[PDB]
């Protein structure tokens, strides 16, 4: 209903998709109003009501408990040719891709805080039965006042399963070598690979690989001064064989990850 929301202009000139600024009339809460065409939907799911919805709606609902680290779906609507998703809109924000573009390689203290929060957000997803499958800096929002990161865009995600995945519609330069070579992957170890790409991206200022040959080659060159502890974590996440990669527990127990800043400290030291 355009009676329940005041709809404003397109956000980000379409870079997030068909997302418009909005305000919930009930209480002036800022929202992001995201439109998805039925004709362009890959995977469908069934709601507990038996209603057929896009998988993105199913995954968003499963993670929407109010944990700060993922975008919260507040409501959704079906239209003849589309679904409309009402998402919370934190302000002020910048996405982590733009943030790294203009700040350059991040100090390890800041990368540690950001990476730690991404890890907690992905753990939350997996605990809710959700595999995001498109972790990358473009899909992470920074709340610049609170110092809190938010994972966004579940449009490539899937229900978390323990069996093999044979489909993938995330970002190729973040996808693991077992996907490039065999078009097969398991969810957790593929997520860990994309987190290694993300961590390299943060401390070096851009992702390490652009070509399939680099992804499968097993060589990580560091173009920026990076501590030995951080290099070790990155190389571990980017092990060619999935079983050689760390678990989320091993990542968060790694020496490089200790003594993380709180979100508010992060904002005060690095963002304000």
């Amino acid at each position: 209903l355009e009676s329940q929301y005041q709809v404003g202009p397109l956000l980000g000139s379409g870079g997030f998709g068909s997302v418009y600024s909005g305000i919930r009339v009930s209480d002036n809460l800022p929202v992001a109003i995201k439109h998805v065409e039925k004709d362009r939907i890959s995977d469908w799911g069934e709601l507990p009501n038996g209603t057929r919805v896009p998988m993105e709606v199913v995954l968003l609902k499963k993670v929407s408990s109010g944990f700060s680290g993922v975008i919260r779906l507040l409501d959704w609507f079906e239209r003849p040719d589309s679904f409309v998703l009402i998402l919370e809109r934190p302000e002020p924000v910048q996405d982590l891709f733009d943030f790294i573009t203009e700040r350059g390689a991040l100090q390890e203290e800041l990368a540690r805080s950001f990476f730690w929060q991404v890890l907690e957000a992905v753990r939350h997803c997996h605990n809710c039965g959700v595999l995001h499958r498109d972790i990358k800096d473009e899909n992470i929002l920074i709340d610049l006042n609170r110092g809190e990161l938010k994972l966004i865009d579940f449009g490539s995600g899937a229900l978390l399963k323990d069996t093999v995945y044979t489909d993938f519609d995330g970002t190729r330069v973040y996808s693991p070598p077992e996907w490039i070579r065999y078009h097969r992957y398991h969810g957790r170890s593929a997520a860990v690979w994309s987190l290694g790409i993300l961590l390299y991206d943060m401390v070096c200022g851009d992702i390490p690989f652009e070509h399939d040959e680099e992804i499968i080659g097993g060589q990580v060159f560091f173009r920026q001064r990076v501590s030995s502890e951080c290099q070790h974590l990155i190389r571990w996440c980017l092990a060619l064989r999935p079983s050689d990669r760390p678990t989320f527990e091993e990542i968060q127990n790694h020496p490089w990850m200790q003594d993380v800043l709180l979100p508010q400290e992060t904002a005060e030291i690095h963002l304000h």
């Binding site: 498109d134 473009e138 865009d153 449009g155 490539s156 970002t171 190729r172 330069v173 200022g205």
Partner: peptide
């Protein structure tokens, strides 16, 4: 060096 976004 050119840093770019990558569509899903």
């Amino acid at each position: 060096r050119k840093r770019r976004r990558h569509p899903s």
